């Protein structure tokens, strides 16, 4: 629950990601816009609750010092290996721990924001350790998260 100088500064930049009109306060409306830009859909009550958790003076908005407290209480991070492995598992059609190079290209060039067939070539070069045209995605994820 303690923060450094450069982090206080970098979090000021962060505050601007939320305070869209730059008026020094984050409203539920601004928070809704940001949360939706991340593909979430908090309800009105959820937006109010997120503001209320850290709204120390009860004025209904988050200011910069309130924003820093939310942060100080949650600077701790944790590795994402399992969640990333679960995301690969979505495409493991036969549940055998493998995704073929062909199927990975097919996923990555059609779904989500996509990679080019060329970016896919670099990803598969790294992922296909054995040169067998198959990706052991548990192993690949362990490598990237090591």
């Amino acid at each position: 629950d303690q923060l450094t100088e450069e982090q206080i500064a970098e979090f000021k930049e962060a505050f601007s990601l939320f305070d869209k009109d730059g008026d020094g306060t984050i409203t539920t409306k601004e928070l809704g816009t940001v949360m939706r830009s991340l593909g979430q859909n908090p309800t009105e009550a959820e937006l109010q609750d997120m503001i209320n958790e850290v709204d120390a003076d009860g004025n209904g908005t988050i200011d910069f010092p309130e924003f820093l407290t939310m942060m100080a209480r949650k600077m701790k991070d944790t590795d994402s290996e399992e969640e990333i492995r679960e995301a690969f598992r979505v495409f493991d059609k036969d549940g055998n721990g493998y995704i073929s190079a062909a199927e990975l290209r097919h996923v990555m060039t059609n779904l989500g924001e996509k990679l080019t067939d060329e970016e896919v070539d670099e990803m598969i070069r790294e992922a296909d350790i054995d040169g067998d045209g198959q990706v052991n995605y548990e192993e690949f994820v362990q490598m990237m998260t090591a």
Partner: protein, 89 residues
């Protein structure tokens, strides 16, 4: 830098929901127990009634817990976005 790591996890209205629902868990647990273990003669209509009330209370507490997990991840989403600014230079 932080690479692929993310924030480690783990209201008045929700709190009100909790005390009332939790009191009813106690209420209905006691009344089911009484009517199934402490009587000479089980009245099944009574047990049914208190089973409905018991499941409603238990499921209300589950709903609160799920909502708190949702809220917590929303907050962690805000923190994670903020933490992208720590990636420098």
């Amino acid at each position: 830098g932080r690479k692929l790591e993310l924030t480690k996890a783990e209201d008045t209205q929700l709190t009100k929901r909790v005390k009332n629902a939790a009191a009813n868990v106690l209420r209905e647990t006691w009344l089911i127990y009484k009517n199934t273990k402490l009587v000479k003669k089980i009245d099944h209509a009574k047990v049914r009634k208190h089973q409905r009330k018991f499941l409603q209370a238990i499921h209300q507490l589950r709903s609160v817990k799920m909502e708190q997990r949702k809220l917590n991840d929303q907050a962690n989403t805000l923190v994670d976005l903020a933490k992208t600014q720590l990636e420098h230079h």
